[PDB]
A paper describes a structure:
Protein synthesis in mitochondria supports bioenergetics of eukaryotic cells and is executed by dedicated mitoribosomes. To provide a representative reference for studying protein synthesis in the mitochondria of fungi, and to reveal how the mitoribosome functions in coordination with its translation partners, we determined structures of the translating mitoribosome from the representative fungal model organism Neurospora crassa. The fungal mito-ribosome consists of 78 different proteins, 23S and 16S rRNAs. Forty-eight bacterial orthologs are extended, and 30 proteins are mitochondria-specific.
After subtracting the signals outside the tRNA binding sites, followed by focused 3D classifications, we obtained three distinct classes with tRNAs occupying P-site (P/P), E site (E/E), and in the hybrid P/E state, at the overall resolutions of 3.05, 3.10, and 2.99 Å, respectively. In the P/P and P/E tRNA states, we detected and modeled co-purified native mitochondrial mRNA, and the density corresponding to the nascent polypeptide was identified in the P/P tRNA state. In the P/P state, the anticodon of the tRNA forms base pairing with the mRNA in the conserved P site of the mtSSU. Further stabilization is provided by the conserved C-terminal Arg315 of uS9m, which forms salt bridges with the backbone phosphates in the anticodon loop of the tRNA. The conserved H69 of mtLSU interacts with the D-arm of the tRNA. The conformation of P/P tRNA is overall similar to bacteria. The A-site finger, known as a functional attenuator and important for keeping the correct reading frame, takes in a straight conformation forming the inter-subunit bridge B1a. The conserved G2453 (G2251) and G2454 (G2252) of the P-loop form base pairs with the CCA terminus of the tRNA, and the emerging peptide is bound to the terminal A76, waiting for peptidyl transfer to the next incoming aminoacyl-tRNA at the A-site. In our structure, the density for an endogenous polypeptide is detected and the involved structural elements at the upper part of the tunnel are conserved with respect to the geometrical parameters, such as the length (~30 Å) and average radius (~5.3 Å). The constriction site between the loops uL4m–uL22m is located 34 Å from the start of the tunnel, and the position correlates well with the E. coli ribosome. The density for the nascent polypeptide can be traced from the starting point at the peptidyl transferase center (PTC) until the beginning of the lower part of the tunnel.
Author numbering:
A (entry chain W): 66 to 122
B (entry chain d): 33 to 218, 243 to 291
C (entry chain Y): 95 to 140
D (entry chain C): 221 to 330
E (entry chain I): 1 to 46, 59 to 131
F (entry chain T): 44 to 88
G (entry chain L): 2 to 193
Write the structure that this text describes.
Amino acid sequence: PKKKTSHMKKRHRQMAGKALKDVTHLNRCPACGNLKRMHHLCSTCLGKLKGFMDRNG
Amino acid sequence: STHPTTAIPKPTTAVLKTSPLAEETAVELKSPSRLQLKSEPGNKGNPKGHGDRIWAFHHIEQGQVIYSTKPVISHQHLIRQQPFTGKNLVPRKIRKDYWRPLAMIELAGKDQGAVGRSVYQKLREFKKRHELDWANEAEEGRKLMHKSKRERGQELNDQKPNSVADMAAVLAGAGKGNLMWQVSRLVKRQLRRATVYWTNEQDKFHAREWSDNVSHEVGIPGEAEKKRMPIRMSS
Amino acid sequence: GPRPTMSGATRLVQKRRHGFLSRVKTKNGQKTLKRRLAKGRLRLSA
Amino acid sequence: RGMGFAGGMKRHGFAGQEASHGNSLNHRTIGSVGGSQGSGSRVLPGKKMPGRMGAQQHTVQNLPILMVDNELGIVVVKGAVAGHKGAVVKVQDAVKKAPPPEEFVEATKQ
Amino acid sequence: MIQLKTMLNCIDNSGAALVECAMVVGQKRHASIGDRIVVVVQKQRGTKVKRGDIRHAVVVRTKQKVQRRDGSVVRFDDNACVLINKAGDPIGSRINGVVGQELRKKKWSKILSMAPMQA
Amino acid sequence: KRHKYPTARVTRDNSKQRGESALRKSGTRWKLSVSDEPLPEPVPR
Amino acid sequence: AGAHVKYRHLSRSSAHRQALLRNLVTSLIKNETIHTTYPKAKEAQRLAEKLITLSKRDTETARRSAQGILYTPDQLLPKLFGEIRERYANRPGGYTRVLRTEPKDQYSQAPSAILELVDGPKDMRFAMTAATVARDREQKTESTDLTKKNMDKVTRFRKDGMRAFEDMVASLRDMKFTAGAINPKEWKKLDR
RNA sequence: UCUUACUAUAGUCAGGACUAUAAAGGUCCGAACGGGUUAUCGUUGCAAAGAUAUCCGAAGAACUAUGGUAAGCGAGUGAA
RNA sequence: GACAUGAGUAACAAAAAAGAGUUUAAGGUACCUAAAAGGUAUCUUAGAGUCUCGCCUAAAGCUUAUGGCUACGUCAAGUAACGGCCUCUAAGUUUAUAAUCUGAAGAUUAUGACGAUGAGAAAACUUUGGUACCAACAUUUAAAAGUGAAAAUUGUGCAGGAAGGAUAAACCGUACCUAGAAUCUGAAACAAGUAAGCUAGUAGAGAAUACGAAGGCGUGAAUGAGAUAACAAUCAUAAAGGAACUCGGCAAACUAACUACCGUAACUUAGGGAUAAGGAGAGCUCAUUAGUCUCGAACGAGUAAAAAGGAAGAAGCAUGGAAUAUUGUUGUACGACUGUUUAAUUAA
RNA sequence: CUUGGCCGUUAAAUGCGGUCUUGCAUGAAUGAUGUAACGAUACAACAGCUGUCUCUAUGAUUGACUCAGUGAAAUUGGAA
RNA sequence: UAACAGUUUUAUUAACCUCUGGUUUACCUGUUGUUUAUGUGCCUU
Ligand SMILES: [K+]
Ligand SMILES: [K+]
Ligand SMILES: [K+]
Ligand SMILES: [K+]
Ligand SMILES: [K+]
Ligand SMILES: [K+]
Ligand SMILES: [K+]
Ligand SMILES: [K+]
Ligand SMILES: [Mg+2]
Ligand SMILES: [Mg+2]
Ligand SMILES: [Mg+2]
Ligand SMILES: [Mg+2]
Ligand SMILES: [Mg+2]
Ligand SMILES: [Mg+2]
Ligand SMILES: [Mg+2]
Ligand SMILES: [Mg+2]
Ligand SMILES: [Mg+2]
Ligand SMILES: [Mg+2]
Ligand SMILES: [Mg+2]
Ligand SMILES: [Mg+2]
Ligand SMILES: [Mg+2]
Ligand SMILES: [Mg+2]
Ligand SMILES: [Mg+2]
Ligand SMILES: [Mg+2]
Ligand SMILES: [Mg+2]
Ligand SMILES: [Mg+2]
Ligand SMILES: [Mg+2]
Ligand SMILES: [Mg+2]
Ligand SMILES: [Mg+2]
Ligand SMILES: [Mg+2]
Ligand SMILES: [Mg+2]
Ligand SMILES: [Mg+2]
Ligand SMILES: [Mg+2]
Ligand SMILES: [Mg+2]
Ligand SMILES: [Mg+2]
Ligand SMILES: [Mg+2]
Ligand SMILES: [Mg+2]
Ligand SMILES: [Mg+2]
Ligand SMILES: [Mg+2]
Ligand SMILES: [Mg+2]
Ligand SMILES: [Mg+2]
Ligand SMILES: [Mg+2]
Ligand SMILES: [Mg+2]
Ligand SMILES: [Mg+2]
Ligand SMILES: [Mg+2]
Ligand SMILES: [Mg+2]
Ligand SMILES: [Zn+2]
């Protein structure tokens, strides 16, 4: 680098259009009703059901 | 290719129940061998006196056992009787200050060395089947399978308790075709008399039960000259 | 540039060159000890 | 057909450089990008450099019609045509050729 | 596809047995059947041409495949030619071997007049 | 043994302890005479 | 500059990428389900359905090709040409199911999924649908159009069919599995 | 304790070939080992001298280990 | 000295490689449950282990050195199955003694002392100089055979191959690490470097080459998961041509090893050149057998014996089938030659 | 001076080899001169061989690229 | 009229895989060395 980068030009590169995008693709689990991700399985029900099918069956 | 057995109940040829898994006892799984139906099997092609006595040495700190036909052990015994149980667990040599005589087996027949070489075989085969194929201690007893490879290899080195139970089994007729039996075939069969010399009286209690043809003596010949006094429970 | 000159170095040669007896028993060595002693050193040799 | 980010050889037909006669890390590179101070002290606009290639319109002119089938719905033209299979194309009379006869233009409208 | 330093087999009774291509006349792309080339005689056979002479030649058959209008492709086992003069006429009087059929369309009727078999 | 000369046909496995491990419980390689019986269980120390 | 990839290479060598799929399909038949990354689940999905297709053939060439995909054929072959062959006798393709899940490893945050065998003992969508009907019957609510659709999907080709589904729902109610579930009529009034 | 030479006590050189020898050769092919020929890579390197391939010697003026000796006015050692 | 910039960028790529289950301790969340608790599931930190797959292997394995900023319950009269200490001395050392020399410091010779990298009784019980010597090389020898050591026997070449002494159990060492996965040296958790023994088997002349039983490993998140642009590195293949490239065949490719095979030019210091050049053969199956070996009873049979074996035969595009050994020839200059040299830009 | 003349080699010879030599400025142990053998020395030619090239193309792995974790350096009078 | 037969080259730019070729690292076939697992496996009364 020939010259030090100013506070202005570095704040541009750091935050101009690189803001964290919000996760808006969320729905509720049909079994427990907890907030889950769209098209994904519920982690709370997956573990419980995965453990419930191990004891009896 | 190896074939491991499962810890399932099975029948024993010995007169006693070697393990809780033993269903039956004194079961004949094969006809009497050549020398089994012989009153006096002799030392045919072996030196004079060979087989009349069988010694057992153990590591007083770790419990590694070694069987020997002679009153002493050499480097051959450690290499041909100690399997690899991990790094820093198989000694490079025999240290005189660690290895002591565990017990000595003497037979009544002063010239029937063949009966001794048979007991020495079943003892070495049982040991090999204790270091390998130990399915009876994987989930029960010491639970070697629930331990680390470092701590597991140390419990496999402690063959002293297992060896004492092998003597009570081998001397009780355990093993297919061992010459500790004596089939008359007039068909009546019986066991041969034997004596076990112990350096520590408490060691003979590793076996849950001993046969009726074994006599227990304290002190091994040649031990007193080394200024090593035996351990007695009654004192 | 520097070289790995302490590879395969033995501690027997450390005592024969820079040991204590190699100095009290020599004319020049007594100066080293007397110099290091006036400075206050704790490690007079090796 | 889309070619993605293309180098200098596939995009501009650059010759490349040597392969073994001492060449160092420059086999498919473009080399110099202009002249020194006396040429502007800058890379001139329009300089041929790597970039995305393809996925652009392309016109193939003067392709005769070999077959015409109404049932199959096909129009067989001679030669090649830009794009992949299953892509839409625009077929029209040639601009560098006289229009079809006046009778044909009327018959089709009729 | 005959190019510079390509070795060919001369199949006429002109005196050359193996010629080396030195120049493709009238084009930049490598020579195919029926193209002119300046060659250099490298071997002879037992006003013939001696070793080292420079003459014009015509590629009669090549080892590279040659597509044709009707989709029929031909391929020979070697590259051969026949020497000619700058005027365009053959030097030899007899051609020994099969020649490519592309000589007819490239104005080489004289070469085909003495061609025993065409392929 | 029929042929005894040192060049006789070799048909034995010279790797005696092939696939035999005590830490992995590989089991015995061959069927021994004490392999059909349960291992005697001793009394712990 | 060249052709597009035919499949995922998964940043592995030729020999390493083949054994990876043979191990994922070997563990799928042994455990009936595996939880791995989504790209690995979708690559093994094409090899798992091509192995069950070999189990529904009669020639020996299919029995030898299946022996070359599994890593313990002697142990897993009787099951492939046995239970599994009988399970998918009437299902024309689509013997596997890939369901997206939360990252298995929170460190890398890599998208994960569950590759399972449909109509199997460890079918996750068959249980998740049973928990939904169990919650609906326990809350006096009406099942949605999507729940009714998933109910038929997980009972059409199953051996017991609806009987096995009603038993799953009954076992989840006697266990109080739906204890603490949020009623669907209160989801619009929740911000967390 | 690097390195050069010397010195004392020790150690190493698969196998094969030719040669007058069973063993007499600064012999030959080629591992270990010892060199570092060419090339590429690397150049804020894995490395303040490395990696890969290729190449040379490999019973000798060979190589290696543990000690010892000779160096800083004169120059120690130096197949230079 | 603190804090910026580059920049949340490079980097965490030794061309071994991972995948799916299980599980312990402590703690953080959600739900069940409101008597605290406990249970189910999940996440974090520090671990352990099972199955499958791959890598190293005359090692990246095991046993021990040099050494050690790894850790302290590591245990011996001696041999088998141990070193030191101790005894003897080599090269050398000496602020020891005597003599001598010397501006002082000191130096010299003799003697003494000291000094291992060497030599030291017995034990599975034990306490003269070829009448030679134990350098190199070769040979022979623990009697069923073969292999490898120990020591000895005999011989060979010149380069001609130590010294000295003899002949009831103290003290010190003993853990762990051996460099591809947490320890040595390289400023460090470095793709480098470092001693000795062992280092499965198949197959080979072999420690070459390929596979790899056990063992270890596939790093302390010092990383992991995706996608598979340009370009770079490291590689594979390629129509026709075959050095047209270039300072120059740089690099790459061709060639290649093996046989008790055939054959081999000019020239020559008569040794060579020469493994010249240039050709032939190879695996599987099998007729056949003088002896050796085996079986039965001289003879017969047998390769589920080692070998020999032929102008025998079968199949395929191909039988030096995969891996390993990097072309041939020719004319000059310089230096006879093998060697040595600027450690780390010049190896001539 | 100079790519010295001539001959051979090349389609083309400032090269190489042979020869003529009036050698700016060869020469006899600062050795002169010709062979065999040897050479990772240097120059030149031939055969074979090849992506060296005509003229590049495709494919594989690791980087490059994106996400998550950790987190440098040279450099910088101030900069719209 | 019908039928039959004949109606440029070179260079350059771009596009395109029908043809001739090249490539093919999860296709088919043959094959060598070695290893692992499974199955099977000699003569005689
Ligand atoms: K500018
Ligand atoms: K050197
Ligand atoms: K001692
Ligand atoms: K003095
Ligand atoms: K080369
Ligand atoms: K043959
Ligand atoms: K040399
Ligand atoms: K095409
Ligand atoms: Mg130790
Ligand atoms: Mg220096
Ligand atoms: Mg050193
Ligand atoms: Mg596309
Ligand atoms: Mg190019
Ligand atoms: Mg390059
Ligand atoms: Mg300007
Ligand atoms: Mg990656
Ligand atoms: Mg492979
Ligand atoms: Mg030194
Ligand atoms: Mg030599
Ligand atoms: Mg660079
Ligand atoms: Mg040589
Ligand atoms: Mg050599
Ligand atoms: Mg940047
Ligand atoms: Mg970037
Ligand atoms: Mg990066
Ligand atoms: Mg918890
Ligand atoms: Mg002394
Ligand atoms: Mg010593
Ligand atoms: Mg390292
Ligand atoms: Mg290493
Ligand atoms: Mg370090
Ligand atoms: Mg090797
Ligand atoms: Mg290790
Ligand atoms: Mg890993
Ligand atoms: Mg080509
Ligand atoms: Mg070709
Ligand atoms: Mg040229
Ligand atoms: Mg040119
Ligand atoms: Mg054929
Ligand atoms: Mg020389
Ligand atoms: Mg240098
Ligand atoms: Mg150099
Ligand atoms: Mg002179
Ligand atoms: Mg990042
Ligand atoms: Mg096509
Ligand atoms: Mg496949
Ligand atoms: Zn849920």
